[PDB]
Amino acid sequence: SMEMDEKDFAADSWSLAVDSSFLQQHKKEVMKQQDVIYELIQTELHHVRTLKIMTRLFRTGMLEELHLEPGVVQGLFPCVDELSDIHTRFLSQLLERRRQALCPGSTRNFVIHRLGDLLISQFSGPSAEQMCKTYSEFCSRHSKALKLYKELYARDKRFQQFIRKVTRPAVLKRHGVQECILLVTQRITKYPLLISRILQHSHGIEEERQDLTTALGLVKELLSNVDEGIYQLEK
Amino acid sequence: AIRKKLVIVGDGACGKTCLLIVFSKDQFPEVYVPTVFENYVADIEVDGKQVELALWDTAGQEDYDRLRPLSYPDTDVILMCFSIDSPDSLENIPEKWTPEVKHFCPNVPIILVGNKKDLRNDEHTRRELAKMKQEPVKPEEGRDMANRIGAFGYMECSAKTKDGVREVFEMATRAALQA
Numbered sequence: 001s002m003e004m005d006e007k008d009f010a011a012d013s014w015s016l017a018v019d020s021s022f023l024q025q026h027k028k029e030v031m032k033q034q035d036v037i038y039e040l041i042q043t044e045l046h047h048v049r050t051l052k053i054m055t056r057l058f059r060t061g062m063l064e065e066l067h068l069e070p071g072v073v074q075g076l077f078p079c080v081d082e083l084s085d086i087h088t089r090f091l092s093q094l095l096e097r098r099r100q101a102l103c104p105g106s107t108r109n110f111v112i113h114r115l116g117d118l119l120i121s122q123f124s125g126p127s128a129e130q131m132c133k134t135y136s137e138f139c140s141r142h143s144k145a146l147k148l149y150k151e152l153y154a155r156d157k158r159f160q161q162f163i164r165k166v167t168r169p170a171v172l173k174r175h176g177v178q179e180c181i182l183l184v185t186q187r188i189t190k191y192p193l194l195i196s197r198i199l200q201h202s203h204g205i206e207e208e209r210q211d212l213t214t215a216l217g218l219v220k221e222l223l224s225n226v227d228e229g230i231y232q233l234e235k
Numbered sequence: 236a237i238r239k240k241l242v243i244v245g246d247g248a249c250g251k252t253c254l255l256i257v258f259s260k261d262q263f264p265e266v267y268v269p270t271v272f273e274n275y276v277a278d279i280e281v282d283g284k285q286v287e288l289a290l291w292d293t294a295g296q297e298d299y300d301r302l303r304p305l306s307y308p309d310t311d312v313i314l315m316c317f318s319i320d321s322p323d324s325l326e327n328i329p330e331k332w333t334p335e336v337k338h339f340c341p342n343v344p345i346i347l348v349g350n351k352k353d354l355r356n357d358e359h360t361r362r363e364l365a366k367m368k369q370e371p372v373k374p375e376e377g378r379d380m381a382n383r384i385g386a387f388g389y390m391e392c393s394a395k396t397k398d399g400v401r402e403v404f405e406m407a408t409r410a411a412l413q414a
């Protein structure tokens with residue numbers, strides 16, 4: 001994670017992130033729409049940070065300090081590079097939308113009016129196929145990854161010391177190995193709740209209401225396809 | 236501090252997400268109520284014992300039968316939620332949620348929780364429910380269902396006012412500590 005984006009999403013809401021003189025200029029319904037879009041981006045930033053802890057802190061640390069066999073590390077962190085690629089690209093598109101919407105002279109005041117289109121692109125065509133394929137593989141390997149972690153922690157002394165060392169800082173409190181795996185599995189089922197609530201406050205422009213409606217249907221088709229393609233693997 | 240895992244289950248309108256948010260901040264959000272809950276590790280001290288209680292929500296997974304059980308591995312305590320303003324959510328407890336939680340979490344204590352107790356004497360709620368020949372769930376109907384499903388205990392709270400919230404999570408911690 002980078003300081004610029006962490007500071008831009010430090011506040012608990014869009015209403016507390018923008019200047020109060022900018023907030024006063026907007027209707028209550030616009031503020032409600034913007035608060036939900038801000039939560040979607042803020043939680044997408046946290047999700048990409050979860051994936052970076054898995055690849056750079058856990059996976060890479062095990063390869064370079066413990067000299068663990070790549071086959072074992074792959075079993076602990078299935079599809080983390082592909083997941084990182086999908087969500088960093090989605091996040092870049094979300095943050096670019098906010099950046100274009102900024103008022104000149106400001107790094108915090110903005111209104112995002114056209115999210116639906118970005119959501120239709122993310123959850124359709126090649127990117128939707130890559131999310132379905134990647135999450136069907138990840139979620140089928142989820143139970144095996146937890147069992148493999150538990151076996152290593154209880155039998156290898158060097159592994160246990162490495163875990164205790166890298167998870168000691170207060171910024172890793174919610175992000176142990178198993179916690180990261182479940183945070184990733186649960187991410188995809190958060191999208192319909194966020195999109196439905198953005199849609200609830202996006203009736204002002206009929207084309208945006210239609211775009212959000214299509215995006216919601218696309219996300220549900222994705223989730224149904226992933227759910228149908230899962231079978232827990234066992235070692 | 237020992238580490239324990241709590242999972243909250245129940246219908247989409249049972250108020251499970253709001254309950255996790257209000258407990259983890261010790262505040263009913265005064266500006267924006269978040270749509271989603273990611274996770275949280277609560278530092279709880281109950282009856283002299285210090286515990287790290289990891290909190291998880293199942294909201295959004297209700298229609299996905301193969302994704303939902305991935306939240307269950309190594310759960311130490313289940314909070315099974317229903318809304319007091321919704322007798323229909325109490326009806327889904329014994330034939331839908333209870334068999335699933337007993338299959339994926341055998342021998343794990345279940346606390347049955349009646350959320351939104353502040354709505355029990357709300358006029359709007361009593362008027363709305365009467366149009367479908369219903370009424371807010373009575374405390375004794377909650378106790379009977381808890382006894383029926385073999386729940387560890389029965390508790391009530393209101394995420395809106397915070398009443399009973401701390402008590403639910405402290406009891407859940409005690410239940411997770413038992414053999």
Ligand SMILES: Cc1ccsc1C(=O)O
Nearest residue numbers: 149150151152153154309
């Ligand atoms: C056996 C084991 C290994 C890492 S966590 C854990 C547990 O008991 O939950």
Ligand SMILES: Cc1ccsc1C(=O)O
Nearest residue numbers: 143304305307308339340
């Ligand atoms: C998916 C699940 C649910 C309860 S245990 C378990 C596992 O695979 O370890």
